[PDB]
Amino acid sequence: PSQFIRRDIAQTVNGSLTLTQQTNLSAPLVSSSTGEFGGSLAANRTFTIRNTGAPTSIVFEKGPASGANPAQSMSIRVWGNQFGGGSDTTRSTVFEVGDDTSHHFYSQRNKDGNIAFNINGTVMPININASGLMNVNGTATFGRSVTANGEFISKSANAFRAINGDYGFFIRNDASNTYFLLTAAGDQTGGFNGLRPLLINNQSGQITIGEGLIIAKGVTINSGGLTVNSRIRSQGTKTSDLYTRAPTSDTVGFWSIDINDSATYNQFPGYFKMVEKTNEVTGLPYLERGEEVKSPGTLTQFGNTLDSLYQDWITYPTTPEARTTRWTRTWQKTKNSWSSFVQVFDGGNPPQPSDIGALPSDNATMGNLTIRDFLRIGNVRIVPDPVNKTVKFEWVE
Amino acid sequence: PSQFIRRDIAQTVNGSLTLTQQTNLSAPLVSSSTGEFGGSLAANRTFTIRNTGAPTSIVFEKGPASGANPAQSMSIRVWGNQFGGGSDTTRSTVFEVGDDTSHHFYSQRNKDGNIAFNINGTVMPININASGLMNVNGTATFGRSVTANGEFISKSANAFRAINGDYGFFIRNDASNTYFLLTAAGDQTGGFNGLRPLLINNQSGQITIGEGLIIAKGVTINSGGLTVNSRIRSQGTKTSDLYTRAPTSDTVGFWSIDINDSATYNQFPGYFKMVEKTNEVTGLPYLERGEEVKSPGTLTQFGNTLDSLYQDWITYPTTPEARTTRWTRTWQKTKNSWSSFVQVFDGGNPPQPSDIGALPSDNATMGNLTIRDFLRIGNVRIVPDPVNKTVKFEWV
Amino acid sequence: PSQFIRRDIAQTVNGSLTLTQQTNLSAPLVSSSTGEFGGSLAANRTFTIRNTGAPTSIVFEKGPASGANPAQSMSIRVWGNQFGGGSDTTRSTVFEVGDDTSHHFYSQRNKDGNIAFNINGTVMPININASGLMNVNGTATFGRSVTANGEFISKSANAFRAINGDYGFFIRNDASNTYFLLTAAGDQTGGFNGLRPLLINNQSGQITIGEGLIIAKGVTINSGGLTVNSRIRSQGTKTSDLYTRAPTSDTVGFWSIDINDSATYNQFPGYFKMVEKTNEVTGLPYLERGEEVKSPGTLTQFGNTLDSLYQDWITYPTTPEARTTRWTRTWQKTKNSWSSFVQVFDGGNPPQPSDIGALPSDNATMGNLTIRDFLRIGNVRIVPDPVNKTVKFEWVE
């Protein structure tokens, strides 16, 4: 009648067909319902998951817990919240991959049009090459060098540290001063010890070096002077020829030298032996200069130029009866020579009557003497007697 | 004939069927055409998108703009340009994910066989662990420490900066000199102010410290000497026992001490009062020594060693008629003592006849004198007369 | 009869049907077998790949090597090894994308529940924003500034380097000392040259500056003193008023000045041209002062305070007959004046009899003299003759 199906015209089948043989189609299959295949599936070029009100997804089933199967099912879901009316409408288009516990990753176009790729864990690339910015909130470690075309800036008080062997060296800006500091040995990442090698006042720029300073190749203080607690050893260059050496631009200035070798000090002036004499009349001692004796001594130079330069020589005693005598000379640029050392006159080295043209206090001899008022010999006074053009001899008493 | 579908052998059906009940299959479905399901679809194990000349893709539709739908449709496409597509041939195999506007990301293998994973925006992981290298073209910020097993190199003139509080401190290599510099207060990322704490010349390595230098625990200049503009205060260690103090390795050298306290300066030589007298005969004045007067003074030492060491003591006046006198002594290592201070003779402090063994210029007494030529008394010469065995007198 | 298909009840079919027109479904399609579509395919909302023991995948075919086709096929596979009984069972759930040669990338959740996203090559984002840690094993390069809230630490002996123009400057902790060093010109990334600008001893903190030091705005040594090899030029500030200038807190201390200009040196003491006289009886010479002659000289100051301050003036000869004479003075704080310069007495500049109140040895005149024992004139001794209350004459031969 029409309870059987036609091969030639359109037809509506109201019984469930089971097809036990291969079904072939050469025209569109259009269903308003589901498809289920117990074997594999293939289609040409494009698979489209259609959306009529809910986000689209692919589900990868986990299957039995055996072989190469995963522990959880996963999905790809394409969704957003721009149209959902929540407190957040900024997740405009999201491609999210995850399992039953949480997403693994997603890409997202924000409502602002920018794209994010979120990874819910650790990203493990080989190389990284980012065209834009980097931020990293946690600790960072690099296995090799780090080069920047810009500046390195630290907001940590301990800012820059170099660790090698037993010690950390570091630069610390504590807001008041910037310090160059060192760790205890074996505490290389830790705090500063008690050493204060160098600091810089952040306000004034003034530097304090706290554990001693050695300088090679000269020092010049341009301004402000120098204060020293509590001695200066200005050590002159000691040469065999100090007695005759012309100064140079390198040897001008202040220094002292200990001339302690006889080959040198024998060329220099000595001390003088002194004999303590007694004035017969008054009993007061006076020193009579005796023989010169060569001695070690200190040579001290002063003055800063090849014109302005002088020296002092101060003998020091090394034998039990040795005395000390000082001597002076001045550099004579126009003569290209040192003046001859002259003796300083002092209470240990007094000028002698013959040095100055003074009559000795006793046992004296002279060419001539003029007496205006009287000469007394023993108890006789000799006085002028001009009225008789002679002298009177007055026995006293 | 029969135009009815045989239930028993192979049948080509040439009208459109419309199946209202569940359709079961137990053998392959094989179509040369499209499929469209208005409900969900499932398959076992594997889904293959066949490629007969155009790249394969999955399209995820956006649907109506409501609920949890995305604003744009997305696609996964597997494509390349090694065999076509304009000028680039190096993108061999690309797995691209994106929306109607642009890709979000892709992986590719290039023609040389290397893999890139491109993200068209911000990658936001928790941790990063890269086995190879890193390049970042833009500014970088780190929330905690940054440790490198290698060196940190900056190609920026301002190279390394430590900011804390009001100030940035920084090292600047300007190509000529390397400077340690400071910002103005509250300009911590900015340029250097006028301070010049320290620079190093890049050619000579000579250092200039520009805002003063304090040093503790000693200074030694190994070579090249020292030049100072424009004074040196070498301040000796003032102790109560300076008069008797033996030098030590610490106190040898040059210094000066102001001995201003009588407890100490009373131990040292004073100045001498002096009275100007006039020689009656010549009219020429001379200074006659009187009482010693204790006085503050400057003690200055010279010499660098326990052998080579001497001192000067220069009194300074603190009362209106006070004079000034210098005194000297030498350290005597072998006797373990300072020599006694001796007075310096100078124009303000001349020797006296008593110091030198000389007769005073008048009112004098002596034991004996010998006169070779003549003794004149008033206007009479007393001379010897051999032809008489005595003296003779001669007027004028 | 039942050689045709019934159109109104359930019908098992055992022929192979070939449908040449569009097939329309309005109820589920349920197959135990495969599906293959030579055109495109679409479903609504969800696609599920079922798993009955082997991991699920999608395969994207490369097709012919033409147009916009890829060089290799790709797949997405969701798989694991937790259940496989192998030596690694930690890869619990893996979402893996790759081609015929290898994976490109994968996400996984491990057995510990943590997520990794592995990229088998170079990750190329625009920006990076990591909420956790960063480790990079290879070389790192940064195009702009690098700012850390924490400390920068290097474990490299050469730790921090600033390159500009021809030179690298760097800080090197070699485990013994920390050095500030410089490259040769044009070797900006290389080793140190021979320069030693600054180093810090890691154990003591002592600093050595090796290529000279200039300091401006003053130096103070708080402790430990100063040693200088091998001279000190303490250069006083030379003003026109040095003769009368009161000291100030800036000018106290030790210095020397070369007073080489007559406008200034004519205000200071001169030297004396000396005149040699000869004792008539001994033939021994003695010097006395001739004319004073103004001269350039060295002015040297000593002392540290406005109380404790003195000066020396040492003339230097600039002509044949010129001689060096020294002069001294003391700052008198309570009088607010320098003492008058007084002449130093020395061998070149001895005191005269008239300076000391001594009788001249030659050609002397005095008011009175008392002789106790004898006066001899030529060959006659005049002696006290107390027995005859006079004086006795005694010719001596």
Numbering used by the authors:
A (entry chain B), C (entry chain A): 893 to 1289
B (entry chain C): 893 to 1288
What's the publication's text?
The proximal half-fiber is formed by a parallel homo-trimer of gp34. The protein is a highly intertwined trimer containing a 2 nm-wide triple β-helix domain interspersed with three wider domains in which each of the monomers forms an anti-parallel β-sheet. The long tail fibers recognize the outer membrane protein C (OmpC) or the lipopolysaccharide (LPS) of E. coli and are responsible for the initial and reversible attachment of the virion. The carboxy-terminal parts of gp34 that we crystallized occupy the part of the proximal tail fiber closest to gp35 (the “knee”).
Crystals belonging to two different space groups (P21 and R32) were obtained for gp34(894–1289). The obtained model was also refined against data collected to 2.0 Å resolution from a native crystal (i.e., not modified with selenomethionine) of the same crystal form (P21 space group), using the same test selection set for calculating the free R-factor selected in thin resolution shells. Here, the refined model contained the same protein residues as before, plus seven glycerol molecules and 1312 water molecules. Both the native and selenomethionine-modified models have good correspondence to the measured data and reasonable stereochemical parameters, although residues at the amino- and carboxy-termini have higher temperature factors and show some disorder.
